[PDB]
């Protein structure tokens, strides 16, 4: 409605403005690299390390950006009470540079991980399924504000 839009415009949303700041694009890569080295430090075979890296990163990103609705602090009357953090990025404007960069990352991650478990069809299928079903679908332009049961 009107009041709702005026409330959503009256203040910059501190819950979703930190993305466009100095060093988030880099921190994503950094945490990916750190997870890789941690699983390497475990000691198992490379395919297990890489599939664990992919699952851990994808599931963490989904649980943080796509699971919880609202803001962790008072913002307005309600304003953003029925939106996840991914739906608040750049005040509900799709396909901005930040969204493009966050979309590209899982695909390139799968491409790099691909050449280690290519010989096993089970791991390859599971990795592709999880990636394309959790890291590319909720971030699409037609899943926006799509509530189901």
């Amino acid at each position: 409605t009107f009041e709702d839009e005026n409330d959503q415009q009256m203040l910059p949303n501190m819950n979703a403005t930190w993305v466009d700041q100095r060093g988030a694009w880099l921190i994503h890569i950094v945490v990916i690299v750190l997870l890789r080295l941690f699983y390497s430090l475990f000691g198992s075979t490379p395919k297990w390390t890489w599939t664990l890296t992919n699952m851990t990163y994808i599931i963490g990103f989904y649980i943080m950006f796509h699971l919880v609705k609202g803001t962790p602090f008072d913002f307005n009357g309600g304003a953003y009470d029925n939106l996840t953090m991914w739906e608040q990025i750049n005040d509900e404007t799709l396909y901005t540079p930040t969204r493009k960069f966050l979309l590209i990352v899982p695909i390139v991650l799968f491409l790099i991980s691909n050449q280690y478990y290519r010989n096993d069809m089970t791991l390859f299928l599971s990795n592709l399924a999880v990636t394309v079903l959790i890291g590319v679908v909720p971030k699409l332009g037609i899943t926006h504000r799509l509530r189901i049961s």
């Binding site: 590209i104 695909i107 390139v108 799968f110 491409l111 691909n114 290519r118 592709l128």
Partner: peptide, 14 residues
């Protein structure tokens, strides 16, 4: 079949 998947992913990226 790997090459087809990789090419499809590249096309999706673009």
């Amino acid at each position: 079949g790997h090459f087809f998947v990789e090419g499809l992913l590249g096309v999706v990226i673009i």
